[PDB]
């Protein structure tokens, strides 16, 4: 299972000029292209060494596609002001996520196309890729207007064809970075708590991709209700980090083991203090 994904963002700023229009592209949840209307010489840029192997007609196209979408979003935001009878001097947000997940063979698994206004669901393309789920009366105006235009047919044409065919190519030309696995280096630290007990901290560092499970065991029992977790955080070099902690008494430290399970590990990792 792989995915191609585009996260688009338009933010207004009545009194600072035209809205800041943003696009970020992902393959398997990893960023590889990016667009920002505010950037000096604003244009579609590479965000990974493997996409840099694309010809110039590739970049001119997306820089022009992006800029064309920017022109529409500026209007949408104006359309979503009268839909809600909102003051013209308020800064508002319109987010858009489209993409296509592809099953192990290569044919389309799921196709995405939803919008969000000021952080809430606005409208979305259903799994049938035929019908729209709108969230409120204002989004129902959009829903009917797209049904008469035939939008989903044009929208599905992308998800089932070009979106799939270019994901199948991105995977073929950028495998060495995307499909690489970096095994997490693991280790445990020791911290005396003030209340007399001890906190053990078991770090999982510098690993790709992001999905990991971290657990502490006592005699085989997993200790989920006494574990303190941190969400996975990016090291900033493309790899990630994560630790888990438990509060164990003195002397009994070597009773507890930490079991690291990543996809870059054939067996899990076991560690004590």
């Amino acid at each position: 299972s792989h995915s191609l994904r585009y996260f688009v963002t338009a933010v207004s700023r009545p009194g600072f000029g035209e809205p800041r229009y943003m696009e970020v592209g992902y393959v398997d949840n990893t960023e590889f292209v990016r667009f920002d209307s505010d950037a000096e010489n604003p244009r579609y840029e590479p965000r990974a060494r493997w996409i840099e192997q694309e010809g110039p007609e590739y970049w001119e196209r997306e820089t022009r596609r992006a800029k064309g979408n920017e022109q529409c979003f500026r209007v949408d935001l104006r359309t979503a002001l009268r839909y809600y009878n909102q003051s013209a001097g308020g800064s508002h947000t319109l987010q858009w996520m489209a993409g296509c997940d592809v099953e192990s063979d290569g044919r389309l698994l799921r196709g995405y196309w939803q919008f969000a206004y000021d952080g809430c669901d606005y409208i979305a393309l259903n799994e049938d890729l035929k019908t729209w789920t709108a969230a409120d009366m204002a989004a129902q105006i959009t829903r009917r207007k797209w049904e008469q235009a035939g939008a989903a047919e044009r929208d599905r044409a992308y998800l089932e064809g070009e979106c799939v065919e270019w994901l199948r190519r991105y995977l073929k030309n950028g495998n060495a970075t995307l499909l690489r696995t970096d095994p997490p280096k693991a280790h445990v630290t020791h911290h005396r708590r003030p209340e007399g007990d001890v906190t053990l901290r078991c770090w999982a560092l510098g690993f790709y991709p992001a999905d990991i499970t971290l657990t502490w065991q006592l005699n085989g029992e997993e200790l989920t209700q006494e574990m303190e977790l941190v969400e996975t955080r990016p090291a900033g070099d493309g790899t990630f980090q994560k630790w888990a902690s438990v509060v164990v008494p003195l002397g009994k430290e070597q009773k507890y083991t930490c079991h690291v399970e990543h996809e870059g590990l054939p067996e899990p990792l076991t560690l004590r203090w």
Binding site: F7, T9, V11, M22, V24, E31, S91, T93, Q95, M97, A116, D118, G119, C120, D121, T189, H191, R201, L205, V230, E231, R233, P234, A235, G236, D237, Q241, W243
Partner: protein, 99 residues
């Protein structure tokens, strides 16, 4: 306004005194996207604070990675202050060397 942000402050590589590391501030789950970030070395504004990975997740909530170059010493203290419309006052998350 909407979603209160969630901050984390940590180094990129296991920190040792003297060696020049990289300091990260990872702010996630906030809305609207307009947000003010500032990394502090003993409360003093650090200059060249890089920015990275401004996007949103399936939650629709935005996130941003603010990093900068630094060197740890056993007396220096670092923090990341984040002003957001969801909070009545800005929150500062000090960098614990063990977190």
């Amino acid at each position: 306004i909407q979603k209160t942000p969630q901050i984390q402050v940590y180094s990129r590589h296991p920190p040792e005194n003297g060696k020049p590391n990289i300091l990260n501030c990872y702010v996630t789950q906030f809305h609207p996207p307009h947000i003010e970030i500032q990394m502090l070395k003993n409360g003093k504004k650090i200059p060249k604070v890089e920015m990275s990975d401004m996007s949103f997740s399936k939650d629709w909530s935005f996130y941003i990675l603010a990093h900068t170059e630094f060197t740890p010493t056993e007396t220096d203290t670092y923090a990341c202050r984040v002003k957001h419309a969801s909070m009545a006052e800005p929150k500062t998350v000090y960098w614990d060397r063990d977190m």
